[model samples]
Target: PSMSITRLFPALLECFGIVLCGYIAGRANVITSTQAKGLGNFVSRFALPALLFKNMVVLNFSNVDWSFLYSILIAKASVFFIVCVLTLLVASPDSRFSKAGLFPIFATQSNDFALGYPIVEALYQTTYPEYLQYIYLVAPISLMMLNPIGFIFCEIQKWKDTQNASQNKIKIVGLGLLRVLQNPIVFMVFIGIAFNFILDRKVPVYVENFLDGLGNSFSGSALFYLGLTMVGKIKRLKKSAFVVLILLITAKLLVLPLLCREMVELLDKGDSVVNHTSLSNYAFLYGVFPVAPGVAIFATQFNMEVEIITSGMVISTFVSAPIMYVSAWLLTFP
Candidate 1:
């Protein structure tokens, strides 16, 4: 009953509005598949990179704690591999390796920017701006650590499906490395880290405003594009796709957050480094954010599980709203 409707109500409703628009436009032939691909390109290439870089450059480097960082890394990284292990033994016999790659992205990566920042702003801005840092910090871990591994699986699947038998393992590994370096999402993360060093908490206001404008465009565009992807495939979904969808939403929404909470508590044992209270509480809620559209983007680029990933993004995001509300309220307790 402790709803901050004034701040919270608008964004949630606004989100659904954009998504519904995308869905309808898709259904009614207002947008073609190529146009949706164009939108996806803008989101993945420009919007997400600029936003991620912007968030990174704004970070207080000294403000982050290794213990706090370690907890989330283990939380996400473990679940990532665990999904791979599950995929290895899966019964459905659908592209299990492909599922191996993408499911972990669904499980491990959460949409901290598009949905998370707004919701955290509503709940914690007045009391704990640091809670928003939780959003910024954990996100790049996926970009940096998890997605590359996911991409390799995707690449491997491609090799399995259509590749020369002449290609060596070294060549494949080298190709993935080269492609990773080219990825703006991956490259901008490092660029952001560099800027964090150069600025010393002193970024130029106009430039800051510029980056902010570009970055701010990501959430809405990403969501709308997600809905656009959904129109054709969801109607055509099979039981196997639904099974993976159900498993991913469950892992992303419920299981991941609980594991994160445990890690935060275990790691933040009050030894006078970071504040255990804030770290644990923020990390707990951080786990509750939905799968980042970047995951869906990965699925799109690699051509694996695109429908399931996009549908999970839509459903998981809606489910995240109430869980976010209740968890934020619960964390306020003594």
Candidate 2:
């Protein structure tokens, strides 16, 4: 069954409406900077992880469409690879290739846990709950692939910038892998997959009840936190900032998702994996997803592209909300 834009708008309204509420309240100093800060902490630490495990434990891993999954994946793979060469071209005088990883991350690693899960739940949960599982499945595209690649480069660059003696390639691999696994979303994803087999897809009644409550809070809380993040001041900018911001935002909002839709059509032309409507909804919607809020953390951890990434993040979040609504509405046409 196809989701009409008219029906989807209620949820989108709920989402966009809720986000605006924070900004207004924030302006009025209702929720304030303080309350929302704690709220974000709770969402990421507690509520968000349960959401993934709740959907994931019961997921039909073997039955999922690899074509749709890979079709979605090709965007990131293509963007990441393409940016290495393109971003590399810009790196010559005084020479720093560290951004190879950072730029790829900026282009592809979306605001997954914070936004994707919640927004998908808002739109797709009641209609197609299994679709929610795609978030859990596709999310590891970063945890398993992109983050490691990003860290590998940034870590190597860290050593070059300054390193201790034991920083051999093997050690870098080991350390990098450990740093990646520390996040609960990915941790739960791995554990959720393991538990899928452990319990034969049947969950404990009480455990489901326990996780369900926490899981349910995620979407609204995420939306609200997103709203809070938007509650800030903006100032003047210059050419260097605009130039870099333009590059990242264009890659993020336009090029990346264009590749996403292309990959989907190329493989699923016959709708073997998903019908055209679902594939269309899933790919481009996912494509319009912006850089993860965690992009700053990645920048800060390595001290890599801190300013560029955070500023791009600010622009992307503000920019993405409208584009997503536009994308959602545009999906109406095809």
Candidate 3:
């Protein structure tokens, strides 16, 4: 019990405090839905971009291994595609679970910034900072790979509902490409990479501190916004929504991690160029992180099932606490 608590305490403690405060504030009406949306916008457009860019700028590009990169890419994309197909086939027309085009987003997205980074830093900062790099990589990869695919899928759904769908195929594809390029997250990621080449030395201390300040504002603000936004939607959850949420949580927190671990191990055994330990830990940690808070925001904007997304974010984040500890024990110790 002592050992278990020791493993669980640090990561869970900080997250619980902030998330709970946000929940309570929401329930208490300290902030309204409009304010919550505004906060979310700031985090997504301003804070998160700074965070991603900062992480990329400081990344040791030499530590990056192609095998590790490709494996993580496969892990995220495979689950996304599979779940997307399943959702399209199974969800009833009345069910927002698939008709609203959420499966791809929910399956692929994880809370890598708000909830994920803090817990990861607590568990791995001392022994394996390189593991954090894997988390860092998720953002850009999602922007470049997952977002475009998801955009196309969601666009197709929109087209299916429209009369002139057949004629708009090229237009839809062009829009998806344009959105991918205009995406603040994707733009920041590319900018960060460009900066890597431009700067021969580390970023100036003042500039670094500025970016850090903007980036550091993301976690707490985003979490609070999540809670605030969820206030009106909690009771609206239907049985179908609950079932879909459970499936998503199970896949995200459990199944995906196991598959990722297997993939990394297989890569290690078959490939000589990859760092097995580092990539393995990456798989475990990536799985343990909860669904992204921004996903709920996206659902709201896209007229999808905001309630289900928020509920999934809230429940899965709480669930991730214990799972993270277990994952830490297995990956770090074993």
Highest-scoring model, TM-score: 2
Off by over 4 Å in 3: 1-8, 93-101, 269-279, 329-334
On a 0 to 1 TM-score scale, where does candidate 1 land against the true structure? 0.83
lDDT of 2 at 35: 83
CA-only RMSD, every prediction:
3.5, 2.8, 3.5
lDDT of 2 by residue, 1-334 (tens): 4544555657567766777876787888888787877998888888977877777778888888777678877778888888877877786533255788788888888876666765776777657666777777787755678778777877777777664776698877877788779877778788888888898888899798889999888777777777776666344468876787888888989888888888877777562444665766777778677778676667878786667877787678768778887887776675
Judge candidate 1 at residue 314 and give its lDDT.
Answer: 70
* Each prediction's TM-score versus the true structure: 0.83, 0.88, 0.86
**Model 1 lDDT, residue 133, Cα:** 74
lDDT (0 to 1) per candidate:
0.75, 0.75, 0.71
Q: Rate residue 200 of model 2 by lDDT.
A: 85
Q: Clashing residue pairs, candidate 2? A: 110-292, 111-292
Tens-digit lDDT track for model 1 on 31-144?
Answer: 988889888888878888888788777787776676767898898888898888888687356577788878888888887766677777776677666767766676766567
* Residue 326 alpha-carbon offset, candidate 1, angstroms: 4.1
Model 3 agreement with the true structure over 81-164: per-residue lDDT tens digits: 778778767777654333335666776688887777776676667666666676777666775787666667666766655647
Residue pairs in clash, model 3: none
Winner on lDDT (2 vs 3): 2
lDDT of 1 at 311: 81
